[PDB]
């Protein structure tokens, strides 16, 4: 059969993808593009309205001396110019990040114990459902105790709410289904078994604060906002004095002792509070993406849906804006989720491993890293040599280094069932690619690549960590595009091949199994295409409180 | 001597030990037992070998609720504790007869580790204690079992947690009384970021010993922060002596007189009478049926009022056997004494102000928690310069079991290890003995 | 002890509430069972729940301070710490928020008192709290029109009075009976209906409110005219200022 | 004439304002309110659409047993319910913070030195204009060098641009005036001469990044985004190699050596990067507000427009959301900018000082503090005693403490011309108020108040600082409502009475003198009223890229 | 003398103080050294450079053996110079915070 990227190459160019030569310079520059023409006309209207020059195609060099390509969003039949995948122009990408930033997981275990011991009061499924009705009024910004309170407009905050989950089926089945993330309904049976065992009798809230507040403020607001309104609803629901010493144990539990942030705070050079992208470990990003509970019979599709999630968040919004800005890094990330290119390479490696070893049956050692990561690296590189239109499409070396090494690293982890040998495969791919083509990425691409082999199995203070626990603040990874979302895919790969329900934190995995999210985390690439088409409806807008 | 003052020093039973000791013989800059306590707390680590072994067996590493399926490793670490600890000690020590200590506790489930003082005299700060301890234990466990290159990163995760993706050692199975230097609220704050429950755990809930350890840490930080330099030095030293060291048996005798039936208000009346009897204050002006007191020695009035504040906490929270009202005692002891006398309260209002916010953040929805989780580096309780937190440690020593976040809950690993160290557990004894030893060098 | 400077009726009343030798005037009689019902923590005939075991059951080490400080009775027993909270109208209620916390730490043992503009609370061990609460509800600490027992929804200290002279209460816990001239408590302090209401007696008349109040106001005694109390406040301000500098 | 708050009290209640008695419990609870009624209906619609209960007026206690009041926005004739002043429901308040968060000031002095010395190229007004045309194409997110860039939609980023200013009038007049903040047009003569003397021959950019990016990301994105597009435009306009060693000096200069952030980063317990509200010092907040260049004949109006700026930003958005959340802190802030109440007290104090001393002519000492702050404190508190409707309006003691002490501290500083004795008068106000009424604020309100007197003139490490340099991270101020925006007013007060052009940074004062901002910083309380009426048009909306 | 304290381009009009610090450097340095040292003739060094424009300060090692870290050097040095300047010129309570700002900057707001 055709390689998976052939249909996209045939749509991009008039030549067959194998052809070596083309002609340039005759497409009229920016005038060849619908989107660039939209932008020229909008810059002229913006500059006139405000009295300051803005977007002008005649500044600097003239885009479009070659074909300005469409991109197929991988696993879809949607083709868009790359401007429609820039995070500024794509409300689905912005909402994906808002839905992570505004979520925190908050236990009810310590709180129920304060109620039973300190107050001498009972906790039952009934007192829990009463509490959930109360906190679903309070959480979006409405009052439950004081007179003369002024409140948020419910329709501006319609995306904020509180659900619960528990491994105890008898509690979970008795609460109003409106408030429950039902593990048996959302997960196939063997994964539901594993997740309910990890949670046991614990009961956890998944709190989502309003997107308009997250956008006005920051990620470190989420667990404070959450704890204020859990604190009000515990007072109202359990008949405490509205502010007694025991009230402080609900605050401490909700903010510190039984909270799971999505990201941890960052050091001063890149100072940020909790729930910012740099603090989200690779194993949590894999567990946020919900492909593992839908597409479990296909470990390549689960792993590459995690790569899409992480390339977009970590390269486009985090490294391309929070840590830089400007035009940014759209196509450093689109390489990893368009034109079915990483998919072709990773399906090759999966078949190579399933036929040679069987999934997760290869020895977990360097001999398996050398075998699989070299075989898959040469396959991917040969596709760029055999298909000139593929090389012109992924024109930057960093894009090709990330895609080839992702496929090599995921395939190594599908062989060993262990993410650390998958990571050694990723670095070996880089060293082989650099020698094969006498180039790799941009000026600074392989800082972490050259420290990489020596730090995969180190145990020293700021070097040694299993790949699931690393993230954008692991030192070697703190700066550069074209790596972080691919490492989240390598973290997912051995666990998708094993059939594991989660990669690093079962509470995070369950917390996104929820169709009341604004973004659909089961189908990240589909969502990216919907936002590129201007068909996705985000939360947070101010239209209700501004003129027509 | 720069200062002429002398104080009489007592033990925790109210008996005299040493009379007429120059004040500076208690200064953190001169007293060798304060130096040994501070260097001891910089270099002491508690290692939970049971906890490391259980994290490995279950692959539960990297923080709350985290697990990596397929990474489990079953290693007989507590069964081979003696050899693992000896192998660690050989990497931790600098020379074989130095002051390195590695000692197993609990049948090998825990180890007390004191990293050699020498590694500190050539270090900027104190993080060599957890970092040299953690790598020596990681390497000793790998070498004991011949753990492979492919699996060894799990031993690192079980010992030190999610660091360096997290800034803190999130999920670690080692503990120290200090916390990381990036969490300081200002430069010079590190001896303040020591949870009240850890000081109470280390001293075994002995009220006077917990108050003395807490005061020694707080007032030593006041020197490191420059607060006790020049004009303010004597105020800080007298605070240390009278509020934390029971100088002149003032705290002890106030508690003895008010312990049976007293209140915060009765302790205040006694302290004002004692200050008048000693010449620390005198009547400046008569208004209508109201004496306005004045002082020619503000640092000594402040010290006497600080000893009363400590006594009032012991009487008020001792009578309830419940620590939460220390926030109210810290507020109203100071508010009452200013309207009783016309003189400024302890730390010129800063104890009172710290107690206003501490009461709010221990009885409201907005943050904070019970008394035991505060510390001199916590935003709510950093404001008074050493005169508030020791009272919170006395109150928690006196709590009979009203707290969810009690020292048994937050500080069990610190208790087991750090209470083994005589100068941490019984500091009042050692700092008194040292002050007597150097009394003629001042 | 001197307690507080000043030459007004307000100043003397502040001193009398603090002074444990001053006998608080008893205005109304309330039964033990009705104090328990108003507090709302336990039902009549329910045993005191515990937060920890009795002190004699625990094995405590030698501590000179614990040996010297006698525990209150509810601490010996292991009782819960519970509360009682009051709101005081600025239209001349007899007690007011700082006056309560100052007086409670002069009169009562083992007390955690908190002051706010619209509420003032004391937390202590349950059986001891019931004994103190009887004194707080029967004496001149309390007026049943200008003070309210309120564990939540405290609004009203700063509101205009209604036509009966009653302070606002969002939850209407204290109801004035036009036929007796007396107020009934119809709900406990957190707002739950009582099986039978509690008589709280007649509101104090305007002359007696003026005699007993501890708030300063232009239409009563103004603080700016109690020049010896204002002198002491300004002295504390200057002495704290100078001390913080050098 | 009447006290300035009488008209608003007559609008709020049926009784005259001196009347001691009213009737409660007859207004139908929430049903008396147009806004509550809109909210009950919207909660019904939200919960039905999403399948989870949300706003419900019957949860907890029943609002509106008393009158739910309208509030006059001070200086306007606009009366709104207080929900229309919650920051979530007020687009003008969200845009005021987005315009500060997305601004940075970036020198061109080091940059021009690198061009002349390292590159050996000349800088003139003409080269500056060519670089400004380039950076106003690039800054909103458009390309100037590479082929096949994908870019931000110009109309989504219409609010992003770069202007400059300099104290040398003839250089200012040679740069194209579309790019120049003209100091002589925007400031009255004596303030223009002061500001131009401070800047001299220095040349500074004022860079505003897109509101949609600031909202997706955080404040610490602003100086990075600014530096990426300053760097591309220096490459393009001065003909560098596109990435040579000298390129890094422009980066270091724009991100570190000549950058002025609006806020500095915060410590780990409240971790946040630069350009978040807690890092903005009180003197900079007085300088951002532009009332000083328009209402300079009236020092009370200038000081209380700064109090409105700071009460909303510091108490509603920063303390009420970033540091807490939920229903939050609307009326703790509205007390300082509604019903003309703080205006009446502060005009009283200004007149008192004029009569006794003359503005700025009193001795700068404790005798002036004791005289003025005590007189003004007793005037304010007498108003609440004389007018029962005034006391029921500012029903929380913290709101009264902040308003009375702000009038006392601003009036002390009008007398001495020095903010430090203003600040001592704020603390003495609180001590007198506390003894007069036997109450002050909420449980935790006077932490800083009791530390206050001794820390005003302290010189120790973390105690001693002139009030203009203090801000929400000064240790005693880091937690509590009802202080920070009033301290910004006290910092403005002596400099308005002296007729100074700025309080703490003249570059900050000029950087907001710009009618291309989206919020009008010359009339902060007018803008708050326009947002409450749902008449303000913010930037950053996604309508262009979402379904019709 | 310019009231330019608290970071780049910052100034507080009206707060200027015209103090001859460099002309009285000897006395100020001696006064600061007496606060910095722990005992007379220990390892404290305070040496003027540049005709009194600069000072080398070496805080005594002993302060460090009772400290967790190294911030006692800037913090003890800053406060000893602030106090010595105030005492040299009898700077008043109302103005002394500007000496603190000129020595240590916008800390602790920054
Ligand atoms: C539960 C607490 C304890 C705590 O930690 N926070 C509370 C409640 C919290 C909630 C109340 C929302 C709700 O009703 O569901 C919010 C809005 C914070 C949040 N979670 O969004 C808040 N307070 Ni409170 N809180 C306020 C105030 C106050 C005043 C109210 C006194 C009165 O007589 O009405 C008193 C403190 C005092 O007495 O000084 C007060 C107490 C309290 N405050 C008591 C509840 C009092 C009661 O039972 O009625 N606040 C104020 O004084 C005015 C501003 C007002 C804030 C809302 C706004 O700014 O718009 C609100 C700020
Ligand atoms: C004290 C501290 O909280 P923790 O004790 O660390 O939970 C802090 N909150 C606050 O300061 C809350 C302030 C805003 C709400 C109250 C305003 S009066 C914070 O979250 O960093
Ligand atoms: O050319 S550089 O490698 O410096 C930057 C690539 S985006
Ligand atoms: O009641 S508390 O002072 O704790 C909170 C006021 S919003
Ligand atoms: Mg859906
Ligand atoms: Mg959808
Ligand atoms: Mg007499
Ligand atoms: Mg009786
Ligand atoms: Mg007069
Ligand atoms: Mg305009
Ligand atoms: Zn944001």
CATH code at B148?
A: 3.30.70.470
| 3-state secondary structure (DSSP) of residue D165 | strand
**Burial (0-12, 13-18, 19+ Cβ within 10 Å), B283:** exposed
Tell me if chain A has a CB within 8 Å of the CB of D375. Answer: no
> Distance between CA A103 and CA A98 in Å, rounded?
9
- Extended strands (E) in D73-202: 79-81, 103-107, 161-166
C238 to D370: CB separation less than 8 angstroms, yes or no: yes
CA–centroid distance, residue A245 to ligand 1 (Å): 16
Pocket of ligand 2 contains residue D269 by CB under 6 Å: yes
**Backbone φ, ψ for residue A186 (5° rounding):** -90, -25
Contact (CB<8Å) B338/C236? yes
Helices (H), B12-168: 32-43, 49-58, 81-92, 117-121, 128-145, 152-160
Residues B110 and B161 in one domain: yes
Contact yes or no for A503/A490 (Cβ under 8 A): no
**With contacts defined as CB-CB under 8 Å, which chain C residues touch B265?**
1, 18, 20, 105-107
**Within 10 Å of residue A62's Cβ, how many Cβ atoms?**
12
Q: Give the distance (Å) from ligand 8 centre to CA of residue B320.
A: 25
Q: Does A118 touch chain C (CB under 8 A)?
A: yes
Q: Which of C23, C25, C52, C28 shows the shortest CA–CA distance to C38?
A: C28
The domain that holds C196 is classified in CATH as: 3.90.320.20
Element (H, E) at D376: helix D366-386
Q: Name the token pair of D52.
A: 């989870």
CATH for A2-100, among 3.30.479.20, 3.90.390.10, 3.30.1330.60, 1.10.357.10? 3.90.390.10
Which strands make up the sheet holding D259-260, listed edge to edge? D161-166, D203-208, D103-107, D259-260
Q: Is D332 one of the catalytic residues?
A: yes
Is-contact D429 B345, C-beta < 8 A?
no
Spatial separation of the C-alpha atoms in residues D435 and C234, rounded to whole Å: 11
User: A515, A527 in Cβ contact below 8 A?
Assistant: no
| HSE toward the beta carbon, residue D341, CA cutoff 13 A | 31
B285 forms bridges with which residues in the sheet?
Answer: B292
Distance CA D425, CA D369 (A): 5
List the single residue in B263, B340, B349 with the smallest CB-CB distance to C3. Answer: B340
Ligand found nearest the CA of C85: 1
**DSSP letters of D52-108?**
S----TTSSS-S-SS---EEEBTTSS-EEEGGGGSGGG-HHHHHHHHHHHTEEEEES
Report the neighbours of A using a cutoff of 3 or more CB pairs below 8 angstroms: B, C, D
Maximum Cα–Cα distance for chain B, whole Å? 85
Nearest to A242 among C49, C80, C152 (CB): C152
Whether residues B15 and B28 share a domain: the answer is yes
Q: What values do phi and psi take at D117, rounded to 5?
A: -90, -55
Which residues are paired to A71 by β-bridges? A80
DSSP chain E: -----SSTT---TT------TGGGHHHHHHHHHHHH-SSTTSS-EEEEEGGGTEEEEE--HHHHHTSSSSTHHHHHHHHHHHHHHHHHHT--TTTHHHHHHHHHTTTTT-
State the Cα–Cα distance between residues D330 and D209, nearest whole angstrom: 28
Is the CB–ligand 4 distance for residue D443 below 6 Å? yes
Cβ contacts from C onto E, under 8 A: 5
Q: Do B382 and D452 touch (CB under 8 A)?
A: no
- Measured in Å, residue D227 CA sits from the centre of ligand 10 at 27
Neighbours of D37 (CB within 10 A): 14
Q: Give the whole-angstrom CA distance, residue C8 versus residue B64.
A: 61
Which listed CATH number (3.30.70.470, 3.30.450.20, 3.30.310.80, 1.10.357.10) goes with A101-275? 3.30.70.470
Any D CB within 8 A of E8 CB: yes
Dist CA A109 CA B338 (whole Å):
45
Quick check: B352 and B274 in contact, CB under 8 A? no
Spell out the alpha helix ranges (H) of A321-437. 330-334, 341-356, 366-386, 388-393, 397-416, 419-437
Distance CA B419, CA B260 (A): 31
**Active-site residue identified among A28, A248, A358, A444:** A444
Smallest CA-to-CA distance from B137 within B37, B48, B246, B11 is with: B48
Please tell me if the CB atom of residue B68 comes closer than 6 angstroms to any atom of ligand 2: no
| Contact at CB, A468 and B165, closer than 8 angstroms | no
Q: Which of D109, B36, D417, B205 shows the shortest CA–CA distance to C60?
A: B205
Output Rg (C-alpha) for chain B, integer angstroms: 23
DSSP code for C192: P
Per CB-CB distance under 8 Å, the chain B contacts of A247 are 363-365
The range of the structural domain enclosing residue B112 comes to 44-190
Domains: count for chain E? 1
SS3 of residue D186 by DSSP:
helix
| Those residues with Cβ within 8 angstroms of residue D515's Cβ, 6 or more apart along the chain or in another chain | none
Answer whether B35 touches A (CB < 8 Å).
Answer: no
Q: How far apart are CA B176 and CA B195, in angstroms?
A: 11
Residues B114 and B217 in one domain: no
Q: How many CA atoms lie within 13 A of A392 on its CB side?
A: 23
> Known catalytic residue: D436?
no
Grouping H, G, I as helix, E, B as strand and the rest as coil, residue B281 is coil
Distance CA D306, CA E81 (A): 35
- What is the C-alpha to C-alpha distance for residues A465 and A461, in angstroms, rounded to an integer? 9
Q: What is the DSSP letter of C160?
A: P
Closest to D111 (Cα-Cα) out of D10, D258, D256: D258
Contacts of E93 (CB under 8 A, 6+ apart): C241, C242, C245, C246, D457
* Token pair recorded at residue C144: 């049943």
Name the 3-class secondary structure at B345: coil
Q: Are A73 and A532 in contact (CB under 8 A)?
A: yes
| Own/partner pairs, C131-137, CB within 8 angstroms, 24+ separation | C132/C84, C132/C108, C133/C35, C133/C38, C133/C39, C133/C84, C134/C30, C134/C32, C134/C35, C135/C24, C136/C84, C136/C86, C137/C28, C137/C30, C137/C35, C137/C38, C137/C200
B430 contacts B423 by C-beta, under 8 angstroms: yes
Minimal CA separation from C149 to chain D, in Å = 17
Name the H helices within B93-232.
Answer: 117-121, 128-145, 152-160, 196-202, 207-224
Residue B180 shares a structural domain with residue B218: no
Sign of the torsion formed by the C-alpha atoms of A294, A300, A304 and A306: positive
Q: What is the Cβ-side half-sphere exposure of residue A109, based on CA atoms within 13 angstroms?
A: 14
User: D70 Cβ partners below 8 Å, 6+ apart?
Assistant: D11, D12, D79, D80, D81
Give the CA radius of gyration of chain D: 25
Identify whether residues B115 and B228 lie together within a single domain.
no
Q: How far apart are CA C207 and CA C210, in angstroms?
A: 5
- CB of E66 within 8 Å of a chain C CB? The answer is no
Beta bridge partners of B45: B113
Q: Which two structure tokens, joined as six digits, stand for D81? A: 């319910």
First to last CA, chain C: 30
**What's the half-sphere exposure (Cβ side, CA atoms, 13 Å) at D542?**
28
Contact of chains A and E by CB distance (3 or more pairs under 8 angstroms) = no
Distance, in Å, from the CA atom of A260 to the CA atom of A206, rounded to the nearest integer, reads 10
Assess contact for D56 and D36: CB atoms under 8 A: no
CA distance C75 to B320: 6
Residue C237, domain extent? 1-246
Atom of ligand 4 nearest to the CA of C116: 3
Neighbouring C-beta atoms of residue E20, cutoff 10 Å: 10
The count of structural domains within chain C is 1
Which residue blocks in A239-310 are alpha helix, DSSP H?
247-252, 282-288, 291-294, 299-310
Interatomic CA distance for residues D260 and D276, integer angstroms:
13
Residue B365 Cβ inside 6 Å of ligand 4? The answer reads no
Instruction: Give the single-character DSSP code of A377.
Output: H
Q: Residue A536: name the closest of A519, A524, A523, A521 by CA.
A: A519
B367 Cβ closer than 6 Å to some ligand 2 atom: yes
Instruction: Classify domain A276-535 at the CATH class level.
Output: mainly alpha
Considering only the C-alpha atoms of chain C, give the largest distance between any 2 of them, rounded to a whole number of Å.
65
Cα–Cα distance, D191 to D193 (Å, whole number) = 5
β-strands C182-187, C174-177 pairing? antiparallel
Same domain assignment for residues B18 and B123: no
Rounded Cα distance, A284 and A315, in Å = 17
Q: How many angstroms is it from D42 CA to the middle of ligand 6?
A: 22
Distances (CA, A) of D278 to A218, C122, D118, D448, D478: 12, 34, 39, 16, 8
Nearest to B312 by CA among B297, B332, B338, B294: B332
Whether E62 and chain D come into contact, CB under 8 Å, resolves to no
- Put simply, the answer to whether B125 touches E74 (Cβ < 8 Å) is no
Tell me which of A146, A229, A236 to substitute to probe ligand 1's pocket, judged by most ligand atoms within 8 Å of the beta carbon: A146
Distance A520 CA to ligand 5 centre (A): 5
Domain boundaries of chain A, sorted by first residue: 2-100, 101-275, 276-535
Strand partners, C198: C185
Q: Which residues are registered as beta bridge partners of B392?
A: none
Looking at CA atoms only, how far is residue A260 from chain B in angstroms? Answer: 8
| Cis peptide, bond prior to residue E108, ω within 30 of zero | yes
Nearest Cα residue to D286 out of D96, D521, D7, D94: D521
Measured distance CA(B149)–CA(A307) in Å, rounded: 27
SS3 B205: coil
**Two structure tokens written together for D455:** 């820390």
- Residue A207 phi/psi, 5° resolution? -105, 130
Residues D407/D412/D418/D420 CA torsion (nearest 10 deg)? -80
* Residues in chain D closer than 8 A to E79 (CB atoms): 459-461
Question: Could you tell me the CA-to-CA distances from D34 to B113, D31, D39, D339, D528 in Å, in that order?
Answer: 68, 8, 9, 20, 20
Cα–Cα nearest to D524, from D284, D311, D297: D311
* CB-CB contact of D469 with D283 (8 Å): yes
CA dist E39 and B437 (Å) reads 18
Is there a catalytic annotation at residue A72?
A: no
* A230 neighbors A250 (Cβ within 8 angstroms): yes
Positive/negative CA dihedral, A437, A440, A443, A449: negative
Residue A203, classed as helix, strand or coil, is strand
A332 is annotated as an active-site residue:
yes
In this complex, do C96 and D438 lie within 8 Å of one another by their Cβ atoms?
yes
Phi and psi torsions of D155, nearest 5°: -80, -20
Distance CA(A40)–CA(A37), nearest Å, equals 5
B331 Cα to the center of ligand 4, angstroms: 16
DSSP A272: B
**Could you identify the residue written with the tokens 């009887």?**
C134
Within 8 A by CB and 6+ apart from B139, the residues are: A459, B87, B88, B91
């Amino acid at each position: 059969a055709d390689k998976l990227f052939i249909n996209a190459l045939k749509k991009k160019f008039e030549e067959s993808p194998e052809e070596k030569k083309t002609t340039f310079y005759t497409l009229g520059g920016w005038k060849q593009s619908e989107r660039k023409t939209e932008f020229v006309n909008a810059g002229k209207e913006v500059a006139a309205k405000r009295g300051i020059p803005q977007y002008n195609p005649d500044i600097g060099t003239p885009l479009g001396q070659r074909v300005l390509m469409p991109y197929q969003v991988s696993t879809t039949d949607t083709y868009v110019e790359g401007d429609d995948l820039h995070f500024v122009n794509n409300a689905a990408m912005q909402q994906m990040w808002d839905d992570i930033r505004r979520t925190v997981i908050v236990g009810l275990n310590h709180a129920h114990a304060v109620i039973e011991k300190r107050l001498g009061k009972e906790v039952t499924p009934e007192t829990i459902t009463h509490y959930l009705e109360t906190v679903n009024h309070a959480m979006p910004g409405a009052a439950v105790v004081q007179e003369h309170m002024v409140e948020t407009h419910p329709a501006l905050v319609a995306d904020s709410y509180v659900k619960v989950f528990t491994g105890n089926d008898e509690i979970a089945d008795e609460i109003d289904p409106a408030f429950v993330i039902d593990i048996n309904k959302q997960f196939p049976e063997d994964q539901a078994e594993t997740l309910k065992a990890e949670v046991g009798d614990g009961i956890w809230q998944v709190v989502r604060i309003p997107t308009i507040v997250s956008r006005t403020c920051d990620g470190a607001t989420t667990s404070r906002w959450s704890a204020m309104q859990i604190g009000m609803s515990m007072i109202s629901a359990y008949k405490q004095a509205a502010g007694e010493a025991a009230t402080g144990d609900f605050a401490y539990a909700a903010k510190h002792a039984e909270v799971i942030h999505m990201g941890t705070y960052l050091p001063v050079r890149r100072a940020r509070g909790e729930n910012e992208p740099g603090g989200v470990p690779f194993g949590y990003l894999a567990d946020i993406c919900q492909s593992s509970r839908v597409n479990y019979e296909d470990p390549v599709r689960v792993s590459l849906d995690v790569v899409a999630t992480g390339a977009m968040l970590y390269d486009q919004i985090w490294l391309g804006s929070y840590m830089s800005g400007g035009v940014g890094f759209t196509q450093y990330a689109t390489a990893a989720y368009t034109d079915n290119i990483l998919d072709d390479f990773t399906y090759f490696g999966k078949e190579y491993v399933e036929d040679k070893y069987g999934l997760c049956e290869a020895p977990n050692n360097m001999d398996t890293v050398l075998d699989v990561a070299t075989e898959v690296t040469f396959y991917g590189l040969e596709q760029y040599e055999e298909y000139p239109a593929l090389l012109e499409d992924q024109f930057g070396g960093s894009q090709r280094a990330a895609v080839v090494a992702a496929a090599a690293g995921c395939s190594t982890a599908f062989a060993t069932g262990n993410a650390q040998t998958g990571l050694s495969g990723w670095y070996l791919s880089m060293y082989l690619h650099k020698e094969q083509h006498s180039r790799l990425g941009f000026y600074g691409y392989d800082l972490q690549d050259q420290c990489g082999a020596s730090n995969v199995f180190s145990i020293r203070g700021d070097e040694g960590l299993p790949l699931e626990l690393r993230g954008p603040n692991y030192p070697n990874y703190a700066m550069n595009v074209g790596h972080q979302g691919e490492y989240a895919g390598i973290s997912q790969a051995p666990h998708a091949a094993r059939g594991d329900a989660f990669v690093f934190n079962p509470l995070v995995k369950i917390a996104f199994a929820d169709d009341n999210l604004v973004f659909d985390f089961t189908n990240v690439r589909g969502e990216f295409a919907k936002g590129a088409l201007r068909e996705f409806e985000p939360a947070g807008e101010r239209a209700l409180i501004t003129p027509a | 001597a720069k200062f002429e003052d002398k104080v009489d020093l007592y033990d925790d039973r109210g008996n005299l030990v040493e009379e007429q000791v120059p004040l500076e013989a208690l200064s953190p800059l001169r007293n060798p037992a304060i130096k040994s306590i501070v260097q001891g707390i910089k270099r002491t680590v508690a290692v939970n070998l049971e906890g490391i072994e259980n994290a490995l067996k279950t692959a539960k590493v990297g923080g709350p609720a985290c697990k990596i399926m397929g990474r489990e490793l079953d290693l007989d670490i507590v069964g081979n504790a003696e050899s693992i600890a000896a192998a660690a000690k050989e990497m931790i020590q600098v020379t074989e007869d130095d002051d390195t200590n590695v000692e197993l506790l609990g049948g090998g489930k825990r180890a007390l580790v004191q990293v050699p003082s020498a590694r500190f005299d050539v270090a900027a700060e104190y993080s060599a204690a957890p970092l040299v301890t953690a790598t020596a234990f990681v390497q000793a466990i790998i070498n004991e079992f011949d753990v492979s290159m492919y699996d060894a990163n799990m031993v690192k995760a079980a010992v030190l947690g999610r660091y360096p993706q997290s800034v803190e050692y999130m999920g670690a199975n080692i503990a120290t009384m200090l916390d990381i230097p990036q969490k300081l609220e200002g430069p010079g704050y590190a001896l303040r970021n020591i949870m009240v429950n850890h000081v109470v755990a280390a001293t075994l809930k002995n009220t006077l010993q917990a108050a003395a350890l807490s005061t020694i840490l707080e007032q030593t930080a006041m020197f490191e922060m420059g607060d006790a330099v020049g004009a303010f030095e004597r105020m800080h030293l007298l605070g240390l002596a009278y509020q934390g060291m029971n100088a002149d048996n003032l705290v002890f005798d106030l508690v003895k007189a008010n312990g049976k039936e007293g209140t915060v208000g009765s302790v205040i009346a006694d302290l004002v009478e004692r200050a008048l009897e000693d010449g620390v204050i005198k009547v400046e002006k008569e208004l209508t049926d109201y004496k306005v007191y004045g002082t020619d020695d503000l640092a000594m009035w402040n010290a006497y009022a600080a000893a009363g504040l400590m006594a009032a906490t012991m009487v008020n929270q001792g009578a309830a056997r419940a620590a939460q009202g220390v926030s109210s005692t810290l507020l109203y002891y100071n508010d009452l004494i200013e309207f009783e006398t016309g003189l400024p309260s302890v730390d010129f209002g800063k104890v009172e102000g710290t107690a206003v916010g501490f009461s709010f953040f221990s009885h409201s929805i907005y943050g904070g928690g019970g008394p035991g989780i505060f510390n001199g580096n916590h935003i709510v309780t950093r404001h008074s310069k050493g005169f508030a937190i020791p009272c919170v440690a006395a109150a928690m020593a006196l709590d009979a079991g009203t707290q969810m976040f009690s020292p048994e809950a937050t500080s069990g690993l610190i208790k087991e290890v750090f209470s083994q160290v005589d100068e941490f557990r019984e500091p009042l004894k050692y700092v008194v003995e040292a002050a007597a030893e150097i009394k003629n060098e001042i | 002890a001197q307690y507080y400077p000043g030459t007004t009726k307000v100043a003397q009343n502040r001193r009398n509430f603090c002074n444990p030798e001053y006998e608080l005037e008893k205005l109304r009689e309330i039964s033990d069972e009705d104090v328990v019902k108003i507090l709302g923590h336990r039902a009549p005939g329910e045993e005191y729940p515990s937060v920890h075991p009795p002190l004699e059951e625990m094995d405590e080490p030698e501590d000179a301070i614990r040996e010297m400080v006698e525990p209150i009775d509810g601490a010996k027993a292991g009782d819960r710490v519970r509360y009682i909270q009051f709101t005081d109208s600025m239209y001349f209620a007899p007690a007011q928020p700082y006056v309560r916390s100052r007086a409670y730490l002069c009169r009562y043992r083992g007390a955690d008192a908190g002051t706010l503009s619209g509420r003032q609370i004391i937390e202590t061990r349950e059986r001891d709290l019931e004994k103190i609460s009887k004194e707080l509800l029967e004496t001149e600490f309390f007026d049943p029109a200008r003070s309210g027992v309120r564990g939540k929804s405290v609004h009203g200290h700063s509101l205009r009075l209604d036509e009966d002279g009653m302070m606002f209460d969002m939850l209407r816990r204290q109801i004035y009976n036009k036929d007796t001239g007396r107020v009934e408590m119809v709900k406990n302090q957190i707002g739950d209906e009582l099986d039978e209401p509690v008589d709280l007696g007649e509101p104090l008349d305007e002359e007696t409110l003026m005699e007993k109040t501890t708030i300063y106001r232009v239409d009563g005694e103004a603080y700016r005219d109690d020049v010896e109390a204002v002198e002491i406040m300004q002295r504390i301000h200057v002495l704290r200022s100078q001390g913080g500098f050098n």
